[PDB]
């Protein structure tokens, strides 16, 4: 008899309140959750985003409400740090605003029309991650506000957000002895507990009966499907009533039963089997929503992932929406979640640390899709791991065991870091972010750089956390570094590849990123305060040409793309021409005419054809073709041009993006 | 070389204000424009939305800005009334939020930080229309808002936001003799060169004068014929100065011919053509009236896919790239303005100024053949009233000789009122068959006027019935139910498009609309009285009746796909379709044949179990399904 009521519509907002106010607002803005007040300002560059407190206003009618006997106000996503008031008394304070928390209030619905009011702020502090980052941290209320209506002996809604059940499954041979334990407050020894594990096909396959002091029972699902990432990400429904004769309240949850391991020398195992995870990372904001993102968006973002091809998803730089989450354990999809402790490493930010790294924990801990819990992103930017970086990183990674005895925990190193630095060795795995080809450096720098480290440190599985380069509509005949071209960050990416899915001790890698993404202080190329390091643009609306370089090697797709569309203008006789596709042989026709077969086991096919006048490229592959247009010029078109051993410029554009 | 300047992005906007600020705020809200602040509370019903003065702020960079001479502010749409800041001066008032308007702040760019702030209100007044209507007021700026840059010598932007170039065709048989007339703004020993294109942009013709009109003659004329051929030929003229240019604007414009039979209905180029669709208010769910061109597109889309001929542009002046859009398409278009409901005395200013605007600015679009004075205005007459429209009309009349002059009758109001006696045509407001009496009424009714003034063409400006997910196999006046609302355009159909006489129906409305004082049908703030949701994501039932009738597009719909318990044993299957022939299939079993004229095939099926029907016209099909049960599924009532 549990109910969930959405509370997103009908709020009042401002940022020029300076104090509660004590009667509802009548002149305010009204908005509609998800929102955000930075969806404008946070996207258009000069870090200039409004950073202070902002009220949002909203009156629970009495009457509106079913008849229960606890009221709690749910809110998941309130970025930074937030408030809430219920008739003008301060009932709560949350701090992080990337994890779910909860609220009761049902005894501060005295009066008939009761004003709830809660304070957002994502301003500047010693206390709350993150501080230092490349990305805008979007304030207001941007994901779900909810209000529970539950029994007065209900499962737990008081503990970091948690769903107030923990399933942890254990695979013995071709069956698995699942462990469901659930959680309560204010029970009764009397009422009864009905444990039920369903099939996917919502068919009964085991079923258990305790008490109210019995929150663990072990039930058994023989012939168990395996959940085996994209191969088939099988999930179970684990579902615990507490029943006088009927049931009073009643948790739910999907899992999937599943075993991996990372080997230092044989990368990612999945279930027994070699399962090379190869992937990207995402963040959670889309352009003009800011991160007030809907379901359909998150559906829409985890569909470019699957046609890309991708094994595994870097979920940083903090916890993600849930229903993300399930969408990746739909997906089969391998996971990689972290917490915003990134960059600079605030003594003052222990308390948050714990907190949102047990919010990440409770909260997601029942998704198959999860494998590993990082613990930071280059927090040794600032300085050295000095006693206090190295006992906080001690706190994080004793603790994610001690909850979680299925997971691994990670990190994610800054480039310029040593490998024999003392906070590389607290974790179980490690992860490096590189930029060599886009910072200082040769892109052929990474191959050696993570043998180096392996020899080193052979039984430390390493990995690509992150690598990327920027790329906009900014085309050339002759691709460098430092002109932004789509053109040399396909062949930045080219060369990754080779590098890195060829050498299986790489555990994973996460190309950053998926999608281009906000950042207010970022100066670089013709479109201000945005990072373009993705292989989608930031409106989802074009994939550049990188992203068919990665589909060639991770999809099924049978595809043939001719890169390079945009460049039409081009001044030399003779062009050079790229064909990405995941089949063996490439037949190119210039106007009709073929210009030759052209075979190629990296499936990036170069080829060359003349350069006149306006010519209509096609290249075919089996029953599979596409299609492209040159025109020969006198002068190279400046709309294609865009005007460590960086230029002046670009370095100040670069070191902008701190403040 | 003019130069046009988006100037939608980064705007400040505040609803608590109560004085032009002096230096750009900073603690206000960031919008973008297209916007309106009645986006959530002028659709959810209560009469509640909003009504007051709210500001916009806005830095003008003198740097970033295409420089020549001149520099105007232009405004698309600001609702309703409206004042602009330069730097803290008073540069422009407009009233009346539907038409374009400018002023020249050339002088005002002082600094190189011109702040910009523009007050709109839309309150409550004697002196602004509209007042009391049926639709919500949307406030702030909801159109575009643009930098014009041009020279010195340019043509008129100061003239009630016309596009200083008015293009008249003339038919001379098989021969057009298109007048050209330009208006310019401190001139001079300066030339004019006139061009005529066609749809390829090859030139049709071309003079040049020193003397702002010009006759061309495009011979072979390829007429605007609705949408059989909705030609439209582009005219271009060029200000020169020796041998370059300093400004030009631009026009397309369509040749044609109509009359308004009292007998034959409308007649277009010599022919019969019936002028038989819809009308479409320019708001949409979530967003109030801030559209954007694809919005646009997508309301074009679905009225054409509909086959209507024809839309009434109610009640007001709409965006200009909709009327474009009717130009491509084909349509023949009702223009009007907010003089609805109510006369006000001192409202008669407004409707000058709001007529003048409409005429001037539309009067190139070749889609719109009847300029609309008035909606309802009776809700009896008196001398103010009828003084009013006559100053109206004449004035209509002698601005724009090639269209005629109409308005919107209440149905209540007396056919002998003397007002109904002043514009060339009439249409009358029923709403027989929702708010009361039976829809055989209408019949009679347009029988009855048409008797007594045979003279004067009668048109149906407006008709409909409410409809929302409700549904029942007995439906009645009042269910609000998807089924009565097919029922009542059925029989609508069947007696307004089978008289002739009848030179214009518009089925009221395209689509459901913003009525924030209304509170029925279970979803308050809404006029549910639209073939398509407000969201434009379902089409109702309705919607495939009219279809049937209209569209060439060969398709067959099944009525009642989401009212599938019932409790009968025999169950009504309706199915609409363009096809001579439609047979229904239950559970693979064919239950017969049917051919319907009037395209409303209605079946007879037993409800056995859970039966999956299907409609087949030849290789067109459509798929239902329905189920028998013991009691009324609740959740199809209104309860
Ligand atoms: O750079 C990215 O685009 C992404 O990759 C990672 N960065 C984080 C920050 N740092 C940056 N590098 C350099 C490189 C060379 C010289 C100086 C710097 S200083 C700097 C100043 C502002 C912004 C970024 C940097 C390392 C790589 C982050 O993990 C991820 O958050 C970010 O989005
Ligand atoms: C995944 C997981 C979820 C948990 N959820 C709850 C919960 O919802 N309610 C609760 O009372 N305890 C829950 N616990 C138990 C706590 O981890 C722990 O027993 C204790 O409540 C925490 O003490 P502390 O955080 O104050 O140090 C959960 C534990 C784990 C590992
Ligand atoms: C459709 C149309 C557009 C017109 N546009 C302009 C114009 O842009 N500039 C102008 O000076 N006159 C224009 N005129 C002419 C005026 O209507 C009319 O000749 C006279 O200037 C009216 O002056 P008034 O504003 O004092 O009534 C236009 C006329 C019509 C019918
Ligand atoms: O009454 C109705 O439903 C409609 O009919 C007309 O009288 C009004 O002009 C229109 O605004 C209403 O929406």
Request: some cysteine; overall charge negative; aromatic content about 12%.
């Amino acid at each position: 008899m549990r109910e969930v009521i959405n509370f997103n519509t009908k709020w009042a907002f401002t940022k020029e309140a300076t104090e509660v106010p004590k009667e509802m607002p009548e002149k305010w803005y009204w908005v509609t959750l998800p929102h955000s007040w930075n969806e404008i300002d946070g996207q258009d560059g000069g870090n200039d985003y409004y950073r202070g407190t902002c009220y949002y206003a909203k009156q629970l009618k009495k009457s509106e409400l079913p008849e229960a006997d606890c009221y709690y106000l749910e809110l998941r996503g309130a970025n930074a740090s937030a408030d809430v008031y219920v008739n003008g008394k301060a009932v709560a304070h949350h701090d992080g605003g990337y994890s779910t928390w909860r609220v009761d209030i049902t005894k501060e619905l005295t009066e008939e029309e009761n004003l709830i009011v809660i304070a957002v702020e994502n301003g500047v502090n010693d206390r709350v991650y993150p501080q230092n980052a490349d990305f805008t941290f979007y304030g207001g209320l941007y994901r779900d506000v909810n209000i529970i209506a539950v029994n007065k002996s209900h499962f737990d809604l008081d503990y970091y957000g948690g769903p107030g059940i923990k399933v942890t499954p254990e695979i013995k041979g071709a069956d698995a002895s699942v462990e469901v334990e659930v959680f309560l407050t204010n029970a009764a020894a009397d009422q009864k507990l009905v444990y039920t594990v369903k099939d996917a096909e919502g068919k009964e396959v085991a079923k258990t009966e305790t008490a109210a002091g019995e929150t663990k029972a072990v039930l058994s699902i023989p012939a168990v499907h395996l959940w085996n990432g994209k191969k088939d990400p099988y999930l179970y429904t684990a579902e615990v009533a507490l029943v006088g004769e009927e049931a009073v309240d009643a948790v739910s949850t999907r899992f999937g039963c599943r075993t991996f391991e990372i080997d230092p020398e044989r990368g990612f195992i999945l279930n027994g089997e070699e399962y090379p995870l190869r992937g990207v990372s995402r963040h959670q904001d889309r352009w003009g929503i800011g991160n007030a993102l809907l379901p359909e968006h998150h559906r829409e973002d985890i569909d470019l992932i699957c046609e890309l091809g991708a094994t595994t998803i870097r979920l940083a730089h903090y916890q993600h929406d849930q229903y993300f989450y399930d969408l990746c354990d739909e997906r089969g999809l391998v996971i990689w979640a972290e917490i915003p402790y990134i960059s600079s490493h605030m003594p003052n930010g222990r308390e948050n640390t714990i907190s949102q790294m047990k919010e990440l924990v409770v909260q997601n801990y029942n998704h198959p899709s999860i494998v590993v819990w990082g613990l930071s992103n280059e927090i040794t930017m600032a300085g050295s791991s000095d006693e206090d970086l190295l006992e906080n990183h001690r706190i994080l990674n004793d603790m994610v065991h001690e909850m979680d005895h299925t997971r691994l925990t990670t990190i994610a190193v800054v480039s310029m870091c040593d490998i024999h630095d003392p906070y590389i060795q607290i974790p179980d795995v490690i992860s490096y972010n590189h930029y060599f080809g886009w910072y200082g450096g040769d892109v052929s720098m990474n191959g050696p750089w993570m043998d180096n480290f392996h020899k080193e440190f052979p039984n430390i599985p390493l990995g690509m956390s992150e690598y990327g380069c920027e790329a906009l509509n900014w085309h050339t005949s002759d691709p460098k570094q430092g002109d932004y071209t789509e053109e040399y960050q396909a062949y930045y990416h080219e060369e990754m590849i080779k590098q890195l899915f060829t050498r299986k001790y790489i555990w994973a890698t996460h190309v950053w990123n998926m999608f281009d993404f906000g950042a207010d202080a970022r100066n670089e190329g013709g479109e201000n305060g945005q990072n373009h390091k993705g292989l989608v643009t930031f409106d989802r609306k074009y994939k550049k040409d990188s992203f068919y370089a990665y589909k060639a090697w991770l999809s099924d797709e049978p595809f043939v793309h001719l890169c390079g569309k945009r460049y039409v203008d081009r001044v030399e006789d003779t062009t050079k021409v790229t064909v990405y596709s995941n089949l063996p042989e490439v037949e190119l026709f210039v106007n009709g005419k073929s210009a030759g077969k052209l075979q190629a086991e990296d499936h990036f096919f170069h080829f060359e054809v003349p350069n006149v006048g306006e010519s209509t490229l096609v290249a075919v592959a089996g029953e599979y073709k596409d299609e492209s247009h040159i025109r020969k010029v006198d002068t190279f078109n400046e709309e294609y041009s865009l005007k460590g051993g960086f230029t002046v410029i670009r370095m100040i554009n670069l070191m902008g993006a701190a403040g």
